[model samples]
Target chain A: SGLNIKENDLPGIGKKFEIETRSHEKMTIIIHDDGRREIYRFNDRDPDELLSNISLDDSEARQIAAILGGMVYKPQALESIEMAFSDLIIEWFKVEKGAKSIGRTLGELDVRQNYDVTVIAIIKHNQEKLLNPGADSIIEENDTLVLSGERKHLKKLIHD
Target chain B: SGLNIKENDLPGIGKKFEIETRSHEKMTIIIHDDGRREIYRFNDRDPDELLSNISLDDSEARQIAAILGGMVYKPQALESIEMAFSDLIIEWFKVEKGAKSIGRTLGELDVRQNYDVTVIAIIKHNQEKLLNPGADSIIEENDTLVLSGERKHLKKLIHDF
Candidate 1:
């Protein structure tokens, strides 16, 4: 008889049952539906303990077919292209609690006079914030910059 | 009375020749039954100039089609693709003219000891040269090493991070 069990009855059944289960089992099948059938025990463990190995064959063919078949695949599509010319590469710096450029602009710090590095873009976590941002931007601590230019020049400016 | 003239004696009467003057002083078209036609001109330069202009038009179209359909549309199709990897962030140090690692293996330098930078490879004149190459690898002076790791650690080791 097929069992019709509810969630509440499962706890009672569990206490009444005492079964020693093997750790693994194996199952085999040949000629699935149209012709023949065979059963194999792959693991000796409980039914839930069995592991299944799956692999793909001809992934590209399947993918292209799925697309032509009107399957729901990628949601987003390419929209447009944009380009901008810039001249700034940046690097990261660890500083004391209170350091210069903590609250200053390129014009205020006179960074060009002191250091060779120019702040291009700042990366905080996953977001990137561009600097000199349209002629009015400020610097803050823990802000990783994407600076460009001569390595020697940048090092001299940042190291100092 | 009918004028008797021999076929060969007809003045300028052939595929290559045409009559420039006539008794009526008028121009007319004369095509041979063999499907050949000729235009007659009193001055040879006038007819030659008109034919030269037609040749120029044909050549100009050829030049424009080649440029648009050739390199401009299908450029770099014959070039090969080169693969490269970016540097992992790490500390960098300058090796003097006669530095310790100058004639030593990169492993001896123990760059991994101070900073987390991994020496992935080296670039020279747009080419990549691997580091710690084999058991017989040597570090050279003025060679730029691309390393990777934390910014703070690299800066501390180089003293200029």
Candidate 2:
């Protein structure tokens, strides 16, 4: 049901784990004393030949694990329409003086409820970055809205 | 045969290039005014959904390009025997007293020719790191040799050194 993991002690420094994946690929991970992980992947054709060697720190390992686990950017209801509208897009929308959303709060605009778009970030003053902006965040004039949503929904944010 | 690229000028900023890969995956690269690049990858199933976003400077971009182009780790003549031996492993060898390889230059030892192992780095005093040491670099006692080679060859260095 899972990979076969074989562990070995490196005597003085650390531990090494060899995992055989379901696809028969062999991966070796060595965790050193200084909290660095060295990953080795073997070539499928030549079992003894190394394909790649990558070293990552503890933080990087967690980030990679989250990415592999689908913890980031997993859409809820897009499986059926995936092929037709493939991809989630990031688009920048600059607020104009006459635009309807300008001078209003994100909560006032009800963006997610109305347009199905999420305001992921706001770039203000060209240097100030506000990531994952909340509902109370104001949509000021000249502020650039960094939005993430489906292509169809994002188009509505721009042209509508 | 190639990606479909669309280029756009970003007013006071820099240029942006959006590319569609062969498998219909979309990627966007924005070259900022300061020469930094912001890269975005969209999920294949939904072009609007971003899978990853990374910002890289000029030097980092070159490093990534080199890795993608396979310029970094192309060992010669090891293709056929690659799977049989599989990994280029790094093992630490602490220089012991009265070792034959000690007090000598790496060039004099002819490590690659004699043992098929390459001394990739050296760690001295437990903190200082010397990466890609030169052939003239001398090995001393208490120095840890960070070597990269086949499993069979590295074992010999641990036993011999």
TM-score between candidate 2 and the true structure: 0.33
Cα lDDT tens digits, model 2, A36-122, are 566676765676987555555443433333222222221222221221123656566678788987778987887766887777668
Docking class of 2: incorrect
Candidate 1 CAPRI-style tier: incorrect
Error of 1 at B91 (Å): 37
lDDT of each: 0.32, 0.58
TM-scores for the candidates: 0.21, 0.33
lDDT tens digits, residue span B6-28, model 2: 77878766667676654465667
Q: Give a tens-digit lDDT track for model 1, residues B3-75.
A: 1111222223322222222121111122232222222222333433321111111112222222222211112
Question: Which runs in model 1 stand beyond 4 Å of their true positions?
Answer: A1-90, A94-96, A112-114, A131-135, B1-161
Backbone collision tally, model 1: 22
After superposition, the stretches of candidate 2 with alpha carbons farther than 4 Å from their true spots are: A1-160, B1-38, B41-48, B62-87
- Against the true structure, whose DockQ is highest? 2
